[PDB]
Amino acid sequence: ADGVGNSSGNWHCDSQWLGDRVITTSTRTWALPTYNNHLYKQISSQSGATNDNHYFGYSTPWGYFDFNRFHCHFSPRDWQRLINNNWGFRPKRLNFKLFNIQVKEVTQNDGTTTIANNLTSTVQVFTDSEYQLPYVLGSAHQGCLPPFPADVFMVPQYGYLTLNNGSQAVGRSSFYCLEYFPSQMLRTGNNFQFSYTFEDVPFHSSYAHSQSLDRLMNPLIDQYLYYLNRTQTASGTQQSRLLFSQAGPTSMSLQAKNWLPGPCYRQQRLSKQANDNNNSNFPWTGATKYHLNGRDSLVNPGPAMASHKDDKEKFFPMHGTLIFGKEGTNANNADLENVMITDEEEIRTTNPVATEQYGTVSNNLQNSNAGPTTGTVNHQGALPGMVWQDRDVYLQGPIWAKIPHTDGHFHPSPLMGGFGLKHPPPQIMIKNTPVPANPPTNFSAAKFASFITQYSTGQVSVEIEWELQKENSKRWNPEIQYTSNYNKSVNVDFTVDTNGVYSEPRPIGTRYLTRNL
Amino acid sequence: ADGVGNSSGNWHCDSQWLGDRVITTSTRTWALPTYNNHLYKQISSQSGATNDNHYFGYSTPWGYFDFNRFHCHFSPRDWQRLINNNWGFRPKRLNFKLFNIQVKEVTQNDGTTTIANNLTSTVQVFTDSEYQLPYVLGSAHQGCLPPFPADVFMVPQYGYLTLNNGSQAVGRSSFYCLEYFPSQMLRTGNNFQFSYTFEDVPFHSSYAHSQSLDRLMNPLIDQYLYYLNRTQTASGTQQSRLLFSQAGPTSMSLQAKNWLPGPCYRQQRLSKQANDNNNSNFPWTGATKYHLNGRDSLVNPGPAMASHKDDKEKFFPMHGTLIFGKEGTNANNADLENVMITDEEEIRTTNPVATEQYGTVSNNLQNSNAGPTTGTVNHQGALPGMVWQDRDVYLQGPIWAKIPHTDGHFHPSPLMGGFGLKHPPPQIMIKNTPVPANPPTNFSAAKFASFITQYSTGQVSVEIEWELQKENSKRWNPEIQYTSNYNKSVNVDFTVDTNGVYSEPRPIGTRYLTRNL
Amino acid sequence: ADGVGNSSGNWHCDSQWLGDRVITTSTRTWALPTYNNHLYKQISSQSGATNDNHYFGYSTPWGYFDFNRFHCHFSPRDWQRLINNNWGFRPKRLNFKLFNIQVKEVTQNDGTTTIANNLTSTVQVFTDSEYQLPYVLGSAHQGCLPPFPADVFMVPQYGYLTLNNGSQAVGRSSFYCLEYFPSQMLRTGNNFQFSYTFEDVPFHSSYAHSQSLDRLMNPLIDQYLYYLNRTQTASGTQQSRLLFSQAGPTSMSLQAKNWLPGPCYRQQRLSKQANDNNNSNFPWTGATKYHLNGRDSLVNPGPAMASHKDDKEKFFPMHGTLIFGKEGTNANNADLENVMITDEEEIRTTNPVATEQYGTVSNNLQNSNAGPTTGTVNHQGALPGMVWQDRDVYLQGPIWAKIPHTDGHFHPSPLMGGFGLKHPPPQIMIKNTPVPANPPTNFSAAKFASFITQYSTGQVSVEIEWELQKENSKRWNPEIQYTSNYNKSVNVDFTVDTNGVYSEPRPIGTRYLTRNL
Numbered sequence A, B, C: 001a002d003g004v005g006n007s008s009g010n011w012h013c014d015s016q017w018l019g020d021r022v023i024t025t026s027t028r029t030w031a032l033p034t035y036n037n038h039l040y041k042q043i044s045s046q047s048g049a050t051n052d053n054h055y056f057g058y059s060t061p062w063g064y065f066d067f068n069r070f071h072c073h074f075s076p077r078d079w080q081r082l083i084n085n086n087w088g089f090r091p092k093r094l095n096f097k098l099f100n101i102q103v104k105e106v107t108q109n110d111g112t113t114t115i116a117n118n119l120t121s122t123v124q125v126f127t128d129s130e131y132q133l134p135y136v137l138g139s140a141h142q143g144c145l146p147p148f149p150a151d152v153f154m155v156p157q158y159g160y161l162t163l164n165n166g167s168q169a170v171g172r173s174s175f176y177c178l179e180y181f182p183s184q185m186l187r188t189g190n191n192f193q194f195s196y197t198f199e200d201v202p203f204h205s206s207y208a209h210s211q212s213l214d215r216l217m218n219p220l221i222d223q224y225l226y227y228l229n230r231t232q233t234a235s236g237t238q239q240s241r242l243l244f245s246q247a248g249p250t251s252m253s254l255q256a257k258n259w260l261p262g263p264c265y266r267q268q269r270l271s272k273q274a275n276d277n278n279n280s281n282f283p284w285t286g287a288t289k290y291h292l293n294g295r296d297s298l299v300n301p302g303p304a305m306a307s308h309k310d311d312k313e314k315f316f317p318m319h320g321t322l323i324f325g326k327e328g329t330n331a332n333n334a335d336l337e338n339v340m341i342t343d344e345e346e347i348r349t350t351n352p353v354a355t356e357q358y359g360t361v362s363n364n365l366q367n368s369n370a371g372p373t374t375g376t377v378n379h380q381g382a383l384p385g386m387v388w389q390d391r392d393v394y395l396q397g398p399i400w401a402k403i404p405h406t407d408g409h410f411h412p413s414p415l416m417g418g419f420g421l422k423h424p425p426p427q428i429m430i431k432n433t434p435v436p437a438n439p440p441t442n443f444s445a446a447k448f449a450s451f452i453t454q455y456s457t458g459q460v461s462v463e464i465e466w467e468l469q470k471e472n473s474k475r476w477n478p479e480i481q482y483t484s485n486y487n488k489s490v491n492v493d494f495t496v497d498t499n500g501v502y503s504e505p506r507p508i509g510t511r512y513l514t515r516n517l
């Protein structure tokens, strides 16, 4: 209830730190085109694609808003405060607003374009509260709010996939008409709002451990539990004998322990230094992949596993980490120097190394005649007594994902990162209401193909309230912090360049502060 | 009381199932042109048309809204729920809204068109509550709301017919000026609404019978009523004698029965297989037709009668069923493969077969000299003790019709299908108020032929509340349900194609669940 | 709550006349066997039967009680009181009881049978209130309570028919397990009861008319309406001329009249005198029949139509009347003297004669050249202004029938006779609970084929309250009454013979008293 000449909202970008919680707000400007001429179209993989790449689905005229990346809600400085001072954080509740809507009509005459306000035109917005539509958010697609507030972004088109057989469609394939959901219709002067409250979810670990999993022992004291030291006599004629000893400071690897490392599903190892890697093409052939319904699919990034062992910085697991492009990077065949490869190194203390075997097991029964042989375990599922760390969340990266609705889920934490949610923040859908062009003067029952070309722009605000977990540590010596380099440079990190382009030089994980196991 | 910049309504398309009742809402976008230059014109059949095809009437600038098809209010899934779980349904009350009106003015300069908002222009809407205008709704014309919500449709022009003699007009011919009815005038920011309540009407049968009409007997037990078994001696010299017997399980056709099949008016039989039908042109000549005021008219589809007898799927009665076109079908001379021919087969148990005689009667009085002869009854009116089923309603098909106001009506159920109503949902009329172009500067009493070319678009919502009748059956074995084929296919049924075109592959009747007679 | 040694009910057979209403009670003794070894079996027509006689269905172990014949509730004297003194009667409410149950176990050793009380054995009884089972009552099957109270009858087996194609079964065929309905289980000392209330139903006509339909005129006075007396000049050279006259006492057939006779569907005429009928076999071939779903079925007895015209007592319509056998009559090929053929003669005044045409209509358009020709109408459906009488109810004959549940019914009065009911008196089902014989001593999952042979007997009471409509007539002269012949005879009518066999010598209609139209 405003009208043409009254702004329907204000610009709120600030972040405020209450010290129990942080409330981060982001207001951005957006532009929504008219997708595929107001038409639902089915889409399917082109025949000739490999079996693994077939798909069947539907593309819709609707757009949608996704804030699911962290840097939407945090400036690099606000991110620094969080990761430096806190052991954990989780989202509590969010608030969403659309305001200052403008709908522009576009005419094209000869080689000139003309844009004019359409004051009576309408835009449609609905949030899906009941999760009745396919949920495309957690797939780490582009189209999220820009990192830098002054940027204007384009609203991505909404489309979804369903069951397929080859490129065809089985009878269970669902078709969803989004025009079948009650949606609010807005003009210039109308605004949209809703609130949301996150369900209870474990704090993310903002900490790295100060202890290895196998080192929890007291280094001074000797155990009371014996282990088998010798299966053979030490001196004289070699003879079979069983000899036992108490494990202690000198040999730690031999002691009894209460816990096991997290589950492993092994990765191939790549070398950053050129010419060290094998010469052959094996992203697909030599990879680790899961076979689902006759289709192979990479395991990416996969179960959380340390990227590299001690003193091996150069190597990284193939398809085992999140990779981010630097500004201006091609979407096809970018060089290693252009991408930013994240590192899981903090989880060494519990999780296995992604490129190394889980361990070793005995594959036979020995006797006097047959010597003991042992097999190598390259994949291990959960065993009683395992402990593990989840993959780290970055400044740019998924905040949440929707736990698929199924009978069973095991440790439902998104494998890209973030907060697994059964009821994730709803999908906000938006489209431009069709405006017909001049109808014929004699009735025809054919459907209109003739529409006025138009688009809409506006403002969007997202306010999320994040709960914090403070550092209680008694650690004497100084902890690692995330710091900016003091040395001079042509450009400042996390800042626009001479041409106005915002860029993020490096990925920033959240794990700096240290805790004990 | 809104203004230019406030939307006058919201988009509500949903359906909600309360389990006693279902409330189905449909919101669509429409475009209304300017019909025949704001002029009432009389229309009449061109001389040279056959006597049967003459007409006389009037075409009006007004448009109108018709939701009278089912699929307007039901998605194919909502239709599946209804027909599978319910023995009957009837409409209770509806609610209608027009909102977000836009009036566009169109100029044409050289080969370029230009469309701009006319903010002060008006649209006129009135509902006819008192049924004072001719009622054109129940005639199964095009122009109803589209099946699929995302489509935009064109509002059909309103015109009506009255008495004629040849192509001329008798003095009783009525002329109705719709500009003579109080109507509401709306600008952008004004909206229109009314409510309606259906009169008590019999539930439609959503069921098929589990028994034939002639099989209601107990198959185990023998009757106490005798019938005439033999008019002649069984053995020896043939002699006239009357012999009686009790009819029983062995011969059921001979038993006494309390009820008769529904009335029959016979149809010609056609074969779907090419070359089986006769070679000659007889849609008109060999048809079944009623002769009214010197004009022949087909009986279409006609009294409800079963389409075919047992084990004769290929044949169908000529002009005896509803026929729907598949998407993209020509309106002229479409092949049998393009049309969708509905089937009345469920009513075999009571109604006669449309292509078969009603029965046989005796045309003489026998004696010893004259043997009994008997005539064939090809048409039968109501006899005491008849029972019959009404024609089935489809997903696309008439919901209601207006029972003509007359002294007498017999079983006033529309012969196309649906709910006969004495006070059907009113007609909603709409037109664009004329806007003159620049008048001359010297007074002339001639009428304006000079108008600003313009059209209007907007939004329309229809909310109907349907009452349901639940299945009480004790049937042990599983009932037939309407199911989608599981096998894979290029396209999914009841879904858009690659080019964005919504299509309905087959007509869906409501009769699946079974009841006893 | 009685036990072995307490009778659970008393014998009430009396009838009592309150003069507004009559309350007739009937108590009888019954015996229920074990039908088809406790098994549901499907039953179907044997292949080789004619198309018309095919059926498909199920036979159940359950029995049932049917009182639907009149003489169950009325003695011949109570029937005489009713039909003589009353213009109409209809049922109001009934009350039903089962009591004094006895279950007997039967062993057979060599050629000797032994019957002993099983005190712990159970019988199952349920009434179907919701009409969920097939309703087999109105089909005029045997098994009703005997006419004469001292007789003991056997409870008939319950089985039902459903859709068939040939002798096979279409997927819509319903199977009903009666063991799926909550039923009361009784031992000796338990009794069963329920009450029922008939829905409002028209009084049956107990009267015959004192006037013909075409004679309602004043015989003294001449009409003011002219009719066409002469189409040709009376004298001189014959010339076309139209001459009109007022119809009056001399010619009554020519007068204008307000009403038409009831609808006719014509019957073949048979002669009771031997050798007068044609010599050939035509019960099936020369009959009147309705064709339903590719099967012919006789119309029996058919729409109510007078049996014979004035002074033609000997002839009767073929399949047009109810026929009852005299005591001791064969069920196959009984002679004309053994059967009792009912007569509809009372309805002459309105209904057409079953063996005569309805009338005559003109089949062409005359001119000077073409003389008028006219067709004969052998079948007529309802026309505005028709009046008709329903078929008469006899002392032995159907009381009611269930109006099939369908969309439309026309004058739903059973064509055998009686009271059409949408909610007829419920079906009372009964069976003997299975008692296994000694099981094997080692578990086997096969079903028991081994049962203790047993049957049950007991008492059944039916009390119906009938409402009466008194004679108001001013008729001066004495009306016909139903009287017993005074002349002496070897046996008395409606009485046992020397051998103890009750017999009914003649059918007794209810129409004696006369009313005006």
Ligand SMILES: Nc1ncnc2c1ncn2[C@H]1C[C@H](O)[C@@H](COP(=O)(O)O)O1
Pocket (backbone or CB within 6 Å): A200, A201, A202, A411, A412, A413, A414, A418, A419, A420, A421
């Ligand atoms: N990311 C995520 N989302 C939801 N549930 C999770 C997740 N990770 C683990 N779990 C499950 C399994 C943990 O033992 C438990 C901790 O819940 P607590 O709240 O700590 O009592 O919740």
Ligand SMILES: Nc1ncnc2c1ncn2[C@H]1C[C@H](O)[C@@H](COP(=O)(O)O)O1
Pocket (backbone or CB within 6 Å): B200, B201, B202, B411, B412, B413, B414, B418, B419, B420, B421, C407, C408, C409
């Ligand atoms: N379609 C339709 N509309 C209106 N009236 C109809 C229709 N079909 C039948 N009838 C009439 C004739 C029925 O016997 C009666 C049932 O009304 P009931 O409500 O079941 O008591 O109503």
Ligand SMILES: Nc1ncnc2c1ncn2[C@H]1C[C@H](O)[C@@H](COP(=O)(O)O)O1
Pocket (backbone or CB within 6 Å): C200, C201, C202, C411, C412, C413, C414, C418, C419, C420, C421
């Ligand atoms: N046998 C039978 N059962 C049910 N309905 C019937 C029957 N015969 C006729 N009718 C219908 C048609 C009559 O015009 C009306 C009289 O109902 P009234 O009660 O007299 O107002 O009821």
